[PDB]
Every structure is written in C-alpha cells, then in structure tokens.
Point group: D2
Chain length 440, copies 4
Amino acid sequence: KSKRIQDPIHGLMEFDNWIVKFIDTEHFQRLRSIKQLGTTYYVYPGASHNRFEHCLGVAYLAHSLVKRIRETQHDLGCSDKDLKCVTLAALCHDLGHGPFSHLFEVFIKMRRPDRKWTHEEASIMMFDDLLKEHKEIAYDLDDEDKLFIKDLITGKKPEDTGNRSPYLFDVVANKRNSIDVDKFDYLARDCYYLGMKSVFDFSRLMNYSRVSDDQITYDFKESYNIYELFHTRYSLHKKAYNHRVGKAIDYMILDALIAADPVLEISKSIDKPSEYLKMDDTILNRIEYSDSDDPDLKKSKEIIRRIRKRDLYKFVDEFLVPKDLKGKFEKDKITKIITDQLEHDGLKKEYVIVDILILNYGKKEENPIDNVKFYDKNQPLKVFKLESSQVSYLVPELFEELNIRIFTRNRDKIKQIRKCFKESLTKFFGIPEPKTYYTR
Amino acid sequence: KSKRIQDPIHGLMEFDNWIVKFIDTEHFQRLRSIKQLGTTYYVYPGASHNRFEHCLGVAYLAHSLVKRIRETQHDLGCSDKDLKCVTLAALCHDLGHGPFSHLFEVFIKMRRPDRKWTHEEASIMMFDDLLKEHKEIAYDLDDEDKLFIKDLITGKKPEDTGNRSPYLFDVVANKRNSIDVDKFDYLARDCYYLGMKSVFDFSRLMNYSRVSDDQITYDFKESYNIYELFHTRYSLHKKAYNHRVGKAIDYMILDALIAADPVLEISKSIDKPSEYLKMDDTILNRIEYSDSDDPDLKKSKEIIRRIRKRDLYKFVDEFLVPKDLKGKFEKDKITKIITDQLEHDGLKKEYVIVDILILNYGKKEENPIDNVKFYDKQPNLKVFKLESSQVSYLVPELFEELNIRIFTRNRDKIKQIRKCFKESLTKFFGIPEPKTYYTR
Amino acid sequence: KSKRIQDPIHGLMEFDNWIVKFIDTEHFQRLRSIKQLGTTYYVYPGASHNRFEHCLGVAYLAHSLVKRIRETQHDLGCSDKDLKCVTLAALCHDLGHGPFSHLFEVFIKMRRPDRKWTHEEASIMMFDDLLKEHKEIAYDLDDEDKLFIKDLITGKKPEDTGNRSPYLFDVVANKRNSIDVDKFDYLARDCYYLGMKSVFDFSRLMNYSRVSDDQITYDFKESYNIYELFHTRYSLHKKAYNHRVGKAIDYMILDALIAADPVLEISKSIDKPSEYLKMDDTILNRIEYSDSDDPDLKKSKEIIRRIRKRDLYKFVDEFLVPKDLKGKFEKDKITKIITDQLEHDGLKKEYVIVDILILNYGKEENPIDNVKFYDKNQPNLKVFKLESSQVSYLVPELFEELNIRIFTRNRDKIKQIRKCFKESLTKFFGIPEPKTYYTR
Amino acid sequence: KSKRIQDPIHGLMEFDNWIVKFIDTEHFQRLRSIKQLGTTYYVYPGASHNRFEHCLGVAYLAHSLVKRIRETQHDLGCSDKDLKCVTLAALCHDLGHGPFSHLFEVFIKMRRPDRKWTHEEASIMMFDDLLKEHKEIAYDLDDEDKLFIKDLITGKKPEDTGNRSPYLFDVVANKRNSIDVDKFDYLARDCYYLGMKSVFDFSRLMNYSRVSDDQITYDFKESYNIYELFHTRYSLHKKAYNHRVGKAIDYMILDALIAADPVLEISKSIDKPSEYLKMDDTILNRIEYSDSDDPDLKKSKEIIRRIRKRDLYKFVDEFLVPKDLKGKFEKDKITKIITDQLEHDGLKKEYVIVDILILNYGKKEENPIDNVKFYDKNQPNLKVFKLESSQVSYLVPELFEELNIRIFTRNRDKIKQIRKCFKESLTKFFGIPEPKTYYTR
Ligand SMILES: Nc1nc2c(ncn2[C@@H]2O[C@H](COP(=O)(O)OP(=O)(O)OP(=O)(O)O)[C@@H](O)[C@H]2O)c(=O)[nH]1
Ligand SMILES: Nc1nc2c(ncn2[C@@H]2O[C@H](COP(=O)(O)OP(=O)(O)OP(=O)(O)O)[C@@H](O)[C@H]2O)c(=O)[nH]1
Ligand SMILES: Nc1nc2c(ncn2[C@@H]2O[C@H](COP(=O)(O)OP(=O)(O)OP(=O)(O)O)[C@@H](O)[C@H]2O)c(=O)[nH]1
Ligand SMILES: Nc1nc2c(ncn2[C@@H]2O[C@H](COP(=O)(O)OP(=O)(O)OP(=O)(O)O)[C@@H](O)[C@H]2O)c(=O)[nH]1
Ligand SMILES: [Ca+2]
Ligand SMILES: [Ca+2]
Ligand SMILES: [Ca+2]
Ligand SMILES: [Ca+2]
Ligand SMILES: [Mn+2]
Ligand SMILES: [Mn+2]
Ligand SMILES: [Mn+2]
Ligand SMILES: [Mn+2]
C-alpha cells in the first residue's frame, strides 16, 4: 500500500499506492537520466542530482500541503479527487524536460525556431501518453479531471482560475505569487547538492499557510521568509546557475547536438512520445562512443573530446549595459554589428559566440511580497497586505540585469576579439569609453 | 605543552599554555556567567551560550589566521610576539562586558550619564587588573606589547595605525572592513544556538585572504561571501537580536536594577576591578532570592517575579519612519509630546516606555564592501576596490533604519496608548494617517 | 493562547495555552538556572544548555507522540485527559533536579545518607507545590489524574501499570524497555551542544510506532535504530559524561558545598519547596562573592577560587577490575585499606579521593530485550520478539565496567599516592602486578 | 596554475596544475558516467553521485595529508616525487571500475570465471593507457615511480613495503589498518548523499596523526574516533550497501547483461583500453533504447522493462547462520540441496536465486583497532603502542564476519512456495530441526 522514499532533503516521504503506480512508469523513470542542473555538474561536481528525485519531493510537498489544507479547513469543500490531481500535477510538472533540462529548449530553438517548442508543452504530451499506455492506473480519472491536472501543471492567473478549487493553482505552478512547492524543493535541493547555504525556510511556509480569498495566504510573521525565497533564487542564479564556464560548456554541448542532428534526428524526438522516451542525457555518451565514419558525428565527437580534455570555449569579454541604454539593445542587431566587426577587421565569425544574460528578480521588476496576502493569528480578521513603507529588508541592487557576454570557439586569439568587442560597443551604444567587465 | 578544547562550532580548538594561563584567570572565567545574547534566552531557549565560549572561538580564529599569515608571507616581518599580542587581544576583547552584556551599557547610561562608560573601557580595566594579579604569566610582555594589545582591542582606523604591523588591526577589531574574526565566531555561534540558518562561510574568508597595502585583502571569489557576512548579521538582527519581547524583558531588568541600585550600588561596580569581578548575570538571582525587607528591593523582586509569571511589559506598536522624516526625528524632542499626550487622555507617564531602534547594515550608514580591497589570483597591478558594476547583490533598502517602538508597563491599556501613539505621530511633524506596524 | 517556541533540535514546538500556564511558573522557570550536564560545561564549553529547554522538548515529543496514537488508533480509548497527564508528566519529570543536576544527588547522599533522596521525589514535591501555589490553573485534572501524572513521572513496571492506558507508561519513564521520549531529547540535545555525532534517529522511532499488548511496539526495521539509542547513551557516557576532569571538578564543588552547608542549609532545602525554589546553580556564585567572615565560607571560597585558577584536584590513577575479581570488591573496604595505607606509609588521608566508576550499557541485558515488534510489510496485527539468533549488530565489549579512580586534593605529590594505590591493589586483590592505566 | 573546485563535503579543494592535467583526461572523466553506489540510486534517490567526485576528494585528502607530513617531519625524506606518486594513486584508485561498480565484477565472473578479472587490474590497464595517450603530462615519472603508483593503488602488507617511504601505503589503500583517506571520503560522501548520519569525524584523523615505525600512527585521543570509522561503515552496510531490493535489481542488471552479451560483446571490453573507455552505466540505456530484433537482445530488453515497471525479483527470505554452523557451510553444496528440493516438489529452478551475503567489520575477521599504533602528546618519549585493553572498550560486532543466505525469486507468485523449500533444504543441510529464518516470527 503506502510507500516510503528516503530523501536527504525531505527525510522519509510517504507515497500512497495510488501515487506509486504513476511513479513506476517508463515515462517518469525516464527522469532518472536527466540532470536537474544540466551542465552545472561539469563545474560543480556536487550537482549530480536528476529531475526524477526533484519531482518526488514536489509531489510529496504538494500532497502534504493540500492534505493539511483539507483537514484543517473542512468547509473548503476540497475533494479527494482535487488532492489526487494536484499530486499528479506536481509529480508530472517536469515530465517534459529534455536532456540537459533547459538547454534542450535552446537546442530546438536553434534547429526548429518555428515550432516554438517548450519543455512544459512536452509535459502535456508525456502525461497523455502515460495515461494511454497505463489507463488501468488512471481508471478513476475523469475527462474534466484530466484537464484539471494539465491546467495545474501550467498554472493560471487569478482571473482565469475557474471554480474548481482556485487555491490549488497556488500549489505547483503559481502565476499570482510564484510561491509554490516546486520552488520549495529545488531551491533547497540545489543548495544541498551545490554545497551552498540559504536562509529561506520552506517548512515554515508549509505549515503556517492558510486558504482565504481564493488563494493561499501566509502568516505576516513569514514576510521576511518570503523575501528569502526569491533571495535564494537570485543568489543561486548569481553563484552557480549562470556560471561562465558552465555557459561555455553549454555552447559546446549545443554544437555537438547540432552536428549529430542530421544522423540521429535529435530535434525530431519531440514529435512522438515513443521517440521522446529514449531521449535523455545519455545521448552525449552515444555520440561519444559512436564508431561511425559520418563527418557529422566526427565533428560532434571532436567537440565532446574537447570537453573531456578541458579545451573549452574561452571567455573573451563581458559588458553590462546601463539602465539608460537598455532600450537600444537588440540581440539580433548587436550580433550583426559584432560579426561585421570581425568580418571587417579580424577573423571568421565562426569563432565568436555572442551570449545574452538576462537576470530578472521576481516577476520582471516587481518588488518582493507583491500580490501575496497575509493574516494574523491573533485577529481571526480579513486578509491584509503590507505596504512598501511598512516593511524593509535586503533587496537586489539591480532588479534587471543585462549582460552581453562574448565567448570564442578558438582559444588562440582572445585579445583581438576583446578589442573588437569594445569597437562594436562604442558605435552601437555610442559610449566612447565602454566600461567592460575587464577594465583596461 | 598544549590543550585541545572541543567546541561545537570550530571542532577541536588547539590552545598553547602561554594563553591557557591567561584563560585560567578568574577574570576570564567570569565570562562563564554572562550570556552572549543577554535576555534572548528568555525567548529563544537555545541561546544558552555565554561570552566565555565565544571568546575562546575568537582567540582560536585570531591565532590560526595570523599563524597562516606568518607561514605564508615571511617578508612581512611579523614576529612571534606579534602573534601573542593579537591572540591576547582576541581573547580579552569582551572582558569588560557586564551582566546581560550590552544591557549594562545602557544601565550606566541612565545612572551615570556623565560617566560615558563603555565595555571597551572595562575591557582595558579588566585586562590591566589581570596582569596586575597574574604578573607571573606576563613576564615576556613589555608595556609596548601591552599597549599594542590595548589598541588592538579598541581597534584603530587605517590612518592611526603606526608601523607596528598595521594589518593586524583588521583581525579582532576591524574599523575599516568590519571583517574581523569576532564577527566570524558569534555569527556562526548565534546561528547554531538560536537555531537559524546562515548564508555566510567564515572558513572561506579565513583561508582565502592575503596581506597587502598594510591591510587584509580578500580573493575576488569571496566577494559574494563578504556580502553574506552582513546578510547573516542583518537577518539575525531582524529575527533574534532585536526581538520585541526581548526588549520588553530588557526594560524590566533595567527597572529592577534601578530599584536595587541604592541598596546594592550596582552602578558603582564599574569603578573597581575587584567589585566588577563579582558582577554578572547572577545578580538577578541574588536580588530575587534575597530576604531583606528594604522598600527599594521590594519593587525589584516584584519586577523579577513578573518575569517568572510572564506578566511582562506589553508591546504596543512600532513605527518605521520614512526616509524623508529621518532628519525630522529627535529622540528627546519627540518623547515630550507623548508625555503630554498621555496626561491629557489616558493615564500617567509611568506606564509608557519609548524605545528607539537603530538597525545598521554595518557600522553607521555605508556599504562595508566598498572599503574592502580585493586581489585576483591574474595578478592585477595592485589590490583593487569593486566598482559600481563589477558586482551586484542584495543591498539593504535602508542602510540605517529608525523604528519608534512603544512599550507599556501596564498590560490593560494596550489600546488606549496605541491610539495616543498614532495621535502623537499624526500631530508631530507627520501625516494624517500614520502607518504603524499594526495599522492593518 | 497556543504558543510556538523555536528550539535548535525540534524546530518550532507548539504548546497549548494550558501547557503555557505550567511553563509560566517560578517552579518551572527555575530550571533555566539548572545546567543539564552539571560540570561538563567546565570541560566542554558547548554544554551550556539547561534543564528548562530539555523539559520543553520532552513535553513537545510526548504530546506529539501520544496525539498521533489517538488519531491513528481510535479503538484505544485514550482520552484527552490522558493526553494531558502524560504531557504534564513529561514537562515536570525533571522538575526536582537540584544544582548541577545529578551532582546534587551525590551531595545529599553524602550529607544525609539516611534520607535516600532522589530528584524524582523532589519532582513530585515540586509538582504538588506548583498546583498549591497556582490554584487558578489545571482545573480539568482531578485527584486521580494527579496520581496518574506522578506515576508516569516515576514510571511503573508492566505488572503494576493498571487499567488506565497502560501503554502511556512507556512514553516518559519507560521501565520495561527504557525507550522513552526523554532519552530521545537529551541524547540529541547533548550531542548537538557537546558537538558530537550519533547514528540514532529518534524521528523514525516517533512516527513508526504502534500500541499493542498494553505497550508501545516498533517497526521491526527499526531494531538497529533501537540498538543505536543505547549505543549513543553508552558513547555519551564514555566520551563526555564520565570525563576524569569533570569528576575532579565534581569533588571540588561537593567539598565547597559541604563547607557552606551548615551556614546556608543547602542539604536542608529539599524539605521545604519554598526553600528549594532558590536552590539552583547560582549558589556557587553567591558563595564565591560572599563577604562574610565565617571560616567555612572561606574554605568554600578557597575551593571555588581553585576552580577559577584551574588548580584542580589531579587525577592520579585508574584501575579496571577483571570480571573474575568483580565479586571480591567493596567500595568501603577498598577505601579503608587505601586510606590506612596512606595513613601508615604516606601523608594525611585528606589528600586522597577514592571514586568508583560504574558503566552499565542498559544490568547485563541485551538492547532488544522486552521490546515487541510489528511487521508493516505484511499487513498484520500481532506482535513478535526478535530472537538473538535472527539479529546481529554492534555490542559493547564490556556490558558492565567497574573502575577505581583516584584523585588527589594536593597536586604537590602524585607519584607517591599512585604507588600506594598499586600496593593496596595487591593487598586487596590477589594480583601481584596491577593492571592499572598508568603502568607505562 | 592551481584550480579550486567546490565540493559539498570538502568545501573548496585546491589542485595543482599537474594534478589538473590528469583530471582533464578522457580516462578520468569516464568516471562521471559510473555511479558510486551502483544500483543503490534505484532505492535511495539521493545517491546520485558518481565516482568522479569521490575520486576528486580522495586525491585531495591524500595530497593534503602527505603534504602536511613533509612540512612537519622533514627528517622522513618524503620527496616531491613521493608526494606526486601517492596523489596519483589516490586519483586513479578507482580508474578501472566498470558499470555499476561491483556489479561488473559479478558479470565478468559469471561470464568468464577463469579470468577472475578485478577492477584493480583494469585500473592498472587504464592507468597505463592514460599515460600512453598523454605522455606529455607524465614526463617526470620513471619506471620505478610507475610501479610505486601502481602498488599504492592495491596496497601492500607491512612486510611487503620496501624502504621507499613505506608509511605512504596507509594513505590510499591501507592493508594493515584499513584507515585510508578513501574511506574518509566515501563514508562522509555516502552519508551526505543517502541522507544518513555518521559518528566518524575524518578531520580529526587527518590532523592528529604522525608517522613513525614506517606507518601512520594516531593520537591516543582519536581512539574512539577510529572506532566510529568502522562503526559508520558497518552501519552503512546494514541499511544501504546491502539493501535487498538493491541486490534484486543487481541480479536484474546481470541477467540483462548476460542476455545481451552475445550481441554487444560486453565482456570483451575488459581486454582493450579503447573499448573500456566506452564502458559505463549508460549501457543500461543503450540496450533499452536500441531497435534490433535479436532474440537475445529481446530477452534483456524485457528485463529492463520490468525494472521500469517495478516488476523486480522479489526477496524471499534470509538466513543468518550461527557461529557453530559457520564451519559446516559451503556455497556450491548448499545451493544443490535447494535446487534439488525445488525440482522435486516444485517448479523449475530458473526462478530461484541463491545469494550469499558476507559482511566484514574490517577486511576479514580481524579487528582493525588491534593493528593501529598510538602515541601520546604529553608523553613524547613513550614509544608508539598498540591498544591492550588499556582504555580499550567500545562497541564491537557480535560476529566479526556475518554470513547470510538470502533467496530471491524471478517470479513473484512463488514467494511463499520457495519459502517452504528454503526451510526444507535448511533442515536437511543443517542439524536444526526447526530453522529460524529472517521472516520467521
Ligand atoms: N579543469 C577542470 N575543472 C573542473 C572540473 N570539474 C569541475 N571543475 C570546476 O569548474 C571550473 C571550470 O573552470 P576551468 O576548467 O578553469 O575552465 P577555464 O576557465 O576556461 O580554464 P582556464 O582558462 O585554464 O582557467 C574549474 O575552476 C573547477 O573549479 C574538471 O574536471 N576539470
Ligand atoms: N585549563 C582549562 N581547560 C578547559 C577549559 N575549558 C575547557 N577545558 C578543557 O578541559 C580539559 C581538562 O582540563 P585540564 O586543564 O587539562 O585539567 P588537568 O588535566 O587536571 O590539568 P593539567 O595538569 O594541565 O593537564 C582540557 O583539556 C580542556 O580541553 C578552561 O577554561 N581551562
Ligand atoms: N510564555 C513563555 N514564552 C516563552 C518562554 N520561553 C520562550 N518563549 C517564547 O517567547 C515568546 C514571547 O512571547 P510571550 O512570552 O507570550 O510574551 P508576550 O508576547 O508579551 O505575551 P502574550 O501577549 O501573551 O503573547 C513566546 O512566543 C515564546 O515562543 C517561556 O518560558 N514562557
Ligand atoms: N516502488 C518504488 N520504490 C522505490 C523507488 N525508488 C526508490 N524506492 C525504494 O525502494 C524500496 C523497495 O522497492 P519496492 O518498490 O518496494 O520493491 P519491492 O520491495 O521489491 O516489492 P514491493 O514492496 O512489493 O513493491 C521502496 O520501499 C522505496 O523506498 C521507485 O521509484 N519506485
Ligand atoms: Ca505575544
Ligand atoms: Ca589534563
Ligand atoms: Ca518492498
Ligand atoms: Ca578557469
Ligand atoms: Mn520543477
Ligand atoms: Mn565578541
Ligand atoms: Mn530528562
Ligand atoms: Mn574509492
């Protein structure tokens, strides 16, 4: 009946036999071969964790959070089916992730930019395919139930929630608060495995929440803890997720996948669920260990061998554009002028890689503790909202960061591309003195 | 002939006999009876630690850091005597702390305002008496070495450093960076004992620093870690150090010390070292259990019995002043108006307590990382200071935050003076509807 | 009403309003000044915790355990009244501890050996006085319920459990198994504060237990966890509790209390609860800082100054008896021949101290004795006992250890007393060569 | 030059540039695709770590320890070459590990028992190939240094260590104490990743040791800490390393490997370095993601399919032999009685699996604390001594060598039936009329 999974983050998690059925499926077990942080493992060797174990924690969190809500608020009318759908939604929210997680999206964009593929779109396809091949374990699931699970995976804004337990949309994919149990898991899981520390305490948000006004409301004593949630995500982005060598290795993995695409048809595995079953991170080993004499795979094997020998794409120069010049930036425009500068004075454009780095705290430029409602235990008083002049705390110095990083495929000539970077910056942005991150 | 002391933060601490004899002085062992966090133990039962164990950690960190500097930079001319002086400075930096730690500094502030007594001065007096009664253990120290220890304890600004190893002044009492091993210990110690998490890693700061420009410079990779030093301290202030009930219990202690002062001469103990040797946290127990029928001591026991019954001074409300009204504030000027407001409607002044809270991200109002010089293991020309864009992270919204907190010695008139605080706020130099802490 | 208290081991413990009424009493608040490990703080600086916080954890653990039992086994009939009794028993079990915890028990044994006093008896008396002094609290409990609480504080053998929830006797003071939530707290709290590690995990024993056969049964997969409970207690005794310098300072505190006993009536405070409320660890400070001219206070003050100066009683030698000579041992007899040996061939007998050390793993019982198990894998309701032939794990080399440790009050001579010990061993025991620990 | 690598166990690890060139070889980076705990990840999802990160820590600890010895005991004569040699042994001590670690040894033994191939032999084979294909990075090593490095990986008894710094054999593969920095790392790394606790503190063992009598001696105050090293490893075996379902999936992987061997020739990979370079855990995916219709491949594909659907081999029962009955026991002889009993009154023997579990507190039935020499800081004149019941009392295993007979079934419908045959064959093998198995109540 009930199962028990030992996890370093959540301890011992209990899953009912109903949950276990969807777990013991080739669709979900596929997540064991998909790394949670992609190429971070190649810079932070502790980041070996996969999306499989992360999804178990989100399902455990969502099930127990909704179970606490149902039992403490019996007048809410939340049914057993509502608890089952939110548990399946949490369990299958990352089912559609591809090899190296978000990097597969960039790969498919570079290959088929018109398909507009995204990982949670594949989550819908994989969820349906699991229900088709294992309809026995989903006998109790209705057609309106099946769409409920899919709508919770993607999340809905507070205006288009409907009448099917609107607070349940705050659990897995939060569009109003961005405070969800999925973030509770990976923030702590990645912190644990990267060997990093965090102040945010998700257990207090797990137990000291409540449902009011069709939304999950939190104790007003937890306001600074909610601050530390997005602070942990901000710090994780600034310390590990956006590491420069990790991005250089990311572009090498892309060039390898592109080269091996015509023979293996990697960018086509997303068209069929049967083909997506076999797509995971082991594709890198398949290319590496391929003995074929195809010039595509030979180029792809060379890039993979370059990873193993640490002969990676080197960094050239970085530039943070000021907020005053943010309006003039354009990814396609800045790429053309830079490549023209290499073509005019320099070498081939094949060497240079123009990378864009967008760091957004919260939702765009929105402050923390926005659209979240608070309560007081003493006053059993309507939900309230704290004003900007009522609470102060730590804040990101720059809410929106625009960084134009330059990588070179060839490690021979870096100083010439570094000079060419300043030449392109002074005539696109007009700044006579481009204050690049490598100042003089 | 050394001694290894086991500690939950630093593991096995190694102490040689030259300082062990200093640790085995009744002057140092007095710190066993002075809690590190004063009255925080009454709200956080885990905060049981005292200043004695903290000072052992600081002495351990100062000795190991300076020993590494001596073993890695032989050209600095740092002697074994210089190792002794900075180690002794660390051990005795908190020697002059009184009962309930900083609570005693504000007790003497009322009783003897002209004295302007600080625990840094008592540390000098206590250190002097230590050498007076234990001159057998200070035979190799001259007055120059003695005066060096005094200066290291008080800390000196970079300009007033002299040529007696100016870099050593950054070790125990940093007046330039605020990055000292004292902060290293108690931040890790308080987090461990309070049960709160920290984002700071002091071991990295200990192992990745070098001496240059007559100061302590840090690796560029530790820039984020330096931010998390003050992040951790800020969060600790916002959650534990400045707890409202902690200050409520504080004001009770001050009142009880005031009533017992004409009988016990508590405020006079800071004048003679042999009188100060008998002054610690236990004076509350001595007053509580004393059976004398003195009228001045009767009120002290009544206040102390109020603590045991948790019939404490009740928090009423607090007001976070806006940035625009900071210059419009004056502590003594505003206290007049709430005194006049209470005698109009309500009761007498004896029930209200006005409290000022100054929360500082680092000493005073400045970003402390702007005073840290860094080095990049691509050897830069000289040690450099981080520019505006070289690094961006979590900055405080208000570097200096002023909070007007209102406490009452009567628990029944919580709403009569909650109004009078708002009427005083709205009538003093403010706004039609003040937004205090409990306004919604 | 309900209050939550942060604890570094249990996180956030919630106490109902009826529990807070007991906490907010001078009887219970007295435990704030009763160190959990007595003089261990003088060897392990991290052991600054008190009996106050330990008691909160036992109450939280006991309450949470028995409440989960009723919510999962409704057929048991465990009423809300029984939940109240076992929670109070856990909260007040250590209410009778005196200064330095168990050390005070040895002190009263040496002073009034005919009283046969124990802190449990003082815990009942402190519980009776608490109710007498607070008539407004604890209205639900009747006289029969008051007897139940006292019986749970002392514990009862399975033959005298009665007919009112006999399983509840396993929660606080377990006599048939010794597996209780009291050990769950201090094993973890002492490890945390001493800076030690343990394999035992009380949380697994908390949520995976079942009540049957009028007792508390456990999952048979936790049989090795039960092994590690008693392993952790055995390891804590062998590493911290029984430290040789800890016992040396123990005798110093005892000698000082003896001198001051006629004046201060320390050993007589266990007769009147009103006198016992002022009996806490700060009594050492009142003696140390006394200005009285009585000769015993000077003798008491001189010993305390020896503690601060670290001129402690020096450990001379220690001898472990073999199993075949255990029966030929008697504390009074071996002390006499050692005393007579010092008197004839040596110095004054006041120098030598003869200390017995008994270390029992659990008598000589096996750690899985008398605990019944249920199989969660196969759905079952019957309990079973694991035979010794179907389990194998770690086990102490010596289940019972008897050591004769000798300390001297005079550190001028040691080798002389050490020689008298060896000659007394050959005269009291038939061995010609003494297998002491200071052989070489 | 030097590089700093962040690790959750050791924090920041520094590596000199010469060590980095070995790390950045395809032979070392292959360990990124080999799980440290084999199939344990299928039971404990936190145990996702690979041999690459574990070997990084071991080389870091081995370098730190030996570097300290050279700086605190100049008179020993430990050369830079010696420090280079032991660090390389630590980095390559797991170089020849096959897919799912210890599982591959059983696959070679089952397929080719005459070879008796061990991953130390493959470690030798892949270490020689590492230097052959990267000769520019090993220019300073001579033939004797290579023999020094190779022997440090295996380890040597105290009677077989020469005069070339014999204490260094205690750093990576300790044959006298079993106290090496290999255990220092994976004991902590496995606990951190499985989500389990440990009483051992390897930091104390790293700094409170001293070399004398051609060995590594430990401070007297660390005697309890040493006991907890083997306490932690013993506890890790009883809950994680020897999990029944982990062993059940171990046999599933084996059956699928034998079934796929005629087509993929997996067992031949242990012969040529170039082929073993492609040998890692990913072969589980290549077999299940192939598309050929070979009947041998179809049999292995089904086994992998039952892994994903948790239609695994079911644990039947376990029998701990008594100490008296341990002398009268033989693996091949007891197995015949069980198959004969199942072929008599049951179904075919293809469903039953006979597994013999051997748990050692040390290496065999010796106590490793009896082979470590201790010293005293307050008595430096006193020669290093062994523990001789003088303050030597702690927790020891009841059986220093635990022998367990476990039965697995390939079909879950015959669990109760095979359970009877296990007790039947137990009665006709041992002189025990009523055997008390694991599931007997
Ligand atoms: N070299 C190397 N670094 C690793 C490896 N695994 C994790 N890392 C970490 O990831 C980071 C990658 O940086 P580098 O390997 O130096 O890449 P790079 O900066 O282009 O190379 P350099 O220009 O020589 O510094 C390193 O600093 C390591 O801390 C590995 O296998 N090899
Ligand atoms: N001296 C001293 N030791 C402390 C103190 N706090 C904790 N300890 C620990 O207590 C242990 C025992 O104290 P010792 O000073 O060694 O007592 P002792 O063994 O009788 O004295 P010695 O003759 O110097 O060895 C030491 O090893 C320290 O690790 C302290 O404040 N002073
Ligand atoms: N009452 C009480 N609280 C404690 C104690 N120890 C720690 N605390 C914590 O300290 C916090 C302070 O709250 P209270 O003691 O109730 O003080 P208060 O808020 O002024 O009192 P109330 O108005 O009744 O809430 C509590 O929330 C507890 O979590 C204790 O011994 N008694
Ligand atoms: N079912 C299942 N168990 C897992 C999984 N991952 C880890 N485990 C753990 O492995 C343990 C044993 O696996 P089980 O699925 O129970 O397989 P089994 O014990 O041989 O057979 P059953 O208990 O009848 O299901 C479980 O108790 C889980 O804690 C998983 O993905 N599915
Ligand atoms: Ca309150
Ligand atoms: Ca000593
Ligand atoms: Ca099972
Ligand atoms: Ca680099
Ligand atoms: Mn996710
Ligand atoms: Mn300090
Ligand atoms: Mn207790
Ligand atoms: Mn290894």
